[PDB]
């Protein structure tokens, strides 16, 4: 319900597991039926984002750190700075996806602390 | 989205296409 629940990723259902026992808090995303499974490193993510009141909608988005190490280039070897990848979750009900949510958050407000 | 006209929308776009809220 909070830690866990049934989340599309990818426009394929499945199942959503934020668990705390694990190396920085991580989320499992294993889908419905056990074939697929993405998990999301809390620590590696810098936001979380989810639909707030004012969206139609109930989904939740884990926003990676960017690759700041090795500024990425363009075709001629130029350089770009990438925007940073997400993990986004699609979810049926707000308020699981506001457990969800404000799970995650709370995890990553604690790296942040200890960023 | 896209860049080269008046009141374009780069960039905003793609943060607005979330449509989601941070909780922090």
């Given at each position: 319900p909070s830690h866990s629940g049934a989340?599309?990723?990818?426009?394929?259902?499945?199942?959503?597991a934020i668990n705390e026992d694990v190396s920085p808090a991580e989320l499992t995303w294993r889908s419905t039926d056990g074939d697929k499974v993405h998990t999301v490193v809390l620590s590696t993510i810098?936001?979380?984002?989810?639909?707030?009141?004012?969206?139609?909608?109930?989904?939740?988005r884990?926003?990676?750190?960017?690759?700041?190490?090795?500024?990425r280039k363009d075709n001629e070897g130029n350089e770009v700075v990438p925007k940073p990848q997400r993990?986004?979750?699609s979810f049926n009900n707000r308020?699981?996806?506001?457990?969800?949510?404000?799970?995650?958050?709370?995890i990553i407000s604690r790296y942040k602390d200890a960023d | 989205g896209g860049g080269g006209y008046d009141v374009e929308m780069e960039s905003?776009?793609?943060?607005?296409?979330?449509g989601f809220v941070e909780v922090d």
């Amino acid at each position: 319900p909070s830690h866990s629940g049934a989340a599309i990723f990818e426009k394929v259902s499945g199942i959503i597991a934020i668990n705390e026992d694990v190396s920085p808090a991580e989320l499992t995303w294993r889908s419905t039926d056990g074939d697929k499974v993405h998990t999301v490193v809390l620590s590696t993510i810098d936001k979380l984002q989810a639909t707030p009141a004012s969206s139609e909608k109930m989904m939740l988005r884990l926003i990676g750190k960017v690759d700041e190490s090795k500024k990425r280039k363009d075709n001629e070897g130029n350089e770009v700075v990438p925007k940073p990848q997400r993990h986004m979750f699609s979810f049926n009900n707000r308020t699981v996806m506001d457990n969800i949510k404000m799970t995650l958050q709370q995890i990553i407000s604690r790296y942040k602390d200890a960023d | 989205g896209g860049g080269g006209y008046d009141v374009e929308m780069e960039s905003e776009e793609e943060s607005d296409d979330d449509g989601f809220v941070e909780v922090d």
